[PDB]
Amino acid sequence: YVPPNLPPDKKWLGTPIEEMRKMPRCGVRLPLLRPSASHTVTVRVDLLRAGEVPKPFPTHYKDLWDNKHVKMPCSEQNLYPVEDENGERTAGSRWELIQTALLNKFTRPQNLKDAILKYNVAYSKKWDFTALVDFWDKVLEEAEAQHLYQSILPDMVKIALCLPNICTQPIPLLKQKMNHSVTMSQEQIASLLANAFFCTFPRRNAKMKSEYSSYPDINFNRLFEGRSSRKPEKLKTLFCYFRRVTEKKPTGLVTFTRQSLEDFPEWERCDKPLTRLHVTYEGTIEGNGRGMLQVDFANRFVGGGVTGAGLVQEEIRFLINPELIVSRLFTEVLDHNECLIITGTEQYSEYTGYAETYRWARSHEDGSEKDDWQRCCTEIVAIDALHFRRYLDQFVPEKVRRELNKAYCGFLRPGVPPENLSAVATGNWGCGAFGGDARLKALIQLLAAAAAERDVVYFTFGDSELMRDIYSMHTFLTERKLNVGKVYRLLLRYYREECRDCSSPGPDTKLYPFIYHAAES
Fold this sequence. Notes:
The structure is a monomer. By secondary structure, the protein is an alpha/beta fold. The chain is built from 15 helices and 14 strands. The protein has a 10-stranded mixed β-sheet with strand order 1-7-14-13-8-12-9-6-5-2, sandwiched between helices. The protein is elongated and about 90 Å long. This is Poly(ADP-ribose) glycohydrolase. It is an enzyme of class 3 (hydrolase). Its EC number is 3.2.1.143.
């Protein structure tokens, strides 16, 4: 069996993208937004109005300093050692110290370093600021620098110092195994992120031991270090966002949901049929996948190295939709059965290149519509693929199954009828440094989608051969009426027949050809 010839000029194959479901059109009427045991809501839902800045709930700051909530910089329990008249330790208020540190004229990058180190004195000989100096004094020309230190920086200080008036409700940690959502305003996120820039979140810096070993970095200190040339583009991207939100308060909401399933399908017996596919070697997940469930190829620590060195797919997404960064404040490292679903973030920047060639291009005007909770209609899911030391490891049935389950967790929305579900916009999940096979991972995601009753739009980013191969295989299987179980069975056969007893870097026969021979013969 050779697959037939397909049109050579054609940029996309399969179901016309016009026919895939997308939000807001496909969505279920949203119920009244309200708090519950499973949903923390940090705003006044009764006052929500398109184009008006949401009001915080409750009205006045309420603090929790414990192991279940974010430890806020503005807590009365955020303390530091002060010397009294005999040189003995008294406890002073770190928030008061932060305020007086940050309320100073920065005319010089050393002024900003000096401020940040006042309430971080333990890191005065650990945190390097070379990349900040470089950005400020060498990358930016004099006019940009001037605007940075007399307008943007002072306005970032202001929203950062208003944290207690803006984020008045404690934020719960989204811990491993929790099925829980937090919805908060874009304005709240701006204040949180301004605090992250100034490295204000307490207890999130220790290496040698911390309560937060299990969480991603949130403070931005590592953005300022090193002799990297990418770092200035990261800063430009983040300052594009900071300029925009300080010049004009954003008005939307954003929902962060951690989802765990304890019981997954017995894939061998799964009778669900394959769903629709649109596959193209042109277009972007964020651009052409507007209104669809957009996959973020995530590190189990969500955002990866975005607050430090790291600029591949996840990091780039967290920089252009920077409100995603705030997930790092409260999202515990993801276990195999978990994902994080973020709804409402907005794209503030456009960019070109990737990793070492990445550059900020320009400001982006997100033209999304907003749902009935005034979230931008942009849903992103962080699902982390496995890292394979050796190519063949990924065909082991337990690894195939782990990837199926992870993707299925990302895609499933329990309760919601499949007709109110948007298509998934994805691509080569885990196929760069993580060693994954594009053709296997394409098929795993197709099976995951099918079991979750969703269509798929798959972007191959310039690989037309991969486009055609993926299209050919989906059509072969659908034409022959092979449900998810039959396909998973063939993946197992490939392993047993071609991988299990193979002493070689690769096997003698590739997966897709094996499937064609096996299924038809």
